[model samples]
Target: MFPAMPLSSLFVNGPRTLCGAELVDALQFVCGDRGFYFNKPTGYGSSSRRACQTGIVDECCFRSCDLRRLEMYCAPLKPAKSA
Candidate 1:
């Protein structure tokens, strides 16, 4: 099935029972063949640092890296362009 659970109404932005690595795999599983894949974040710690650098307040950055919001940071990678 798609993702950790069957591909149900649980489309995008749904709560994932999976961890960071599993979420990464799930993202690739769905997006790999297409043209988009979310890059794995460098753990929650590093993400907080990066978020701060991006102008997020310390508290905001810290809170931002939690699993629920961290998925947002799994920015997508564009596929090769062809004519």
Candidate 2:
């Protein structure tokens, strides 16, 4: 019942089942509210380039947390390939 799952439950429950966009939105929301930075790499076909910007990494403004433990709440990200 929290806006999302609690950090503690994340570990026990494993990754939350969500669509790719939803997952990203969740991550952005958490990180933005909490002092972590999310970076998007640059260059054509550089993965994040098309969706975001090229080489445009920015501070998350959210509090920093243990990324190693992020797996609990976050699902593995599989970037869609370019056509």
TM-score to true structure, per model: 0.21, 0.21
Give the alpha-carbon lDDT of every model.
0.36, 0.31
| Global fold similarity of model 2 (TM-score) | 0.21
- 1-83, model 2: which lDDT tens digit per residue? 23465432332222222112222444434544232222334333466423332111211112233333232333323344411
**What clash count goes with each model?**
0, 8
Instruction: For candidate 1, write residues 15-70 as lDDT tens digits.
Output: 23222233333333354433223332435645642432421122223344443433
Candidate 2 lDDT score relative to the true structure: 0.31
Which candidate leads in lDDT? 1
Candidate 1 ranges beyond 4 A from true positions: 1-18, 33-83
Native-to-model Cα distance after best TM-score fit, residue 18 in candidate 1, in Å:
8.5
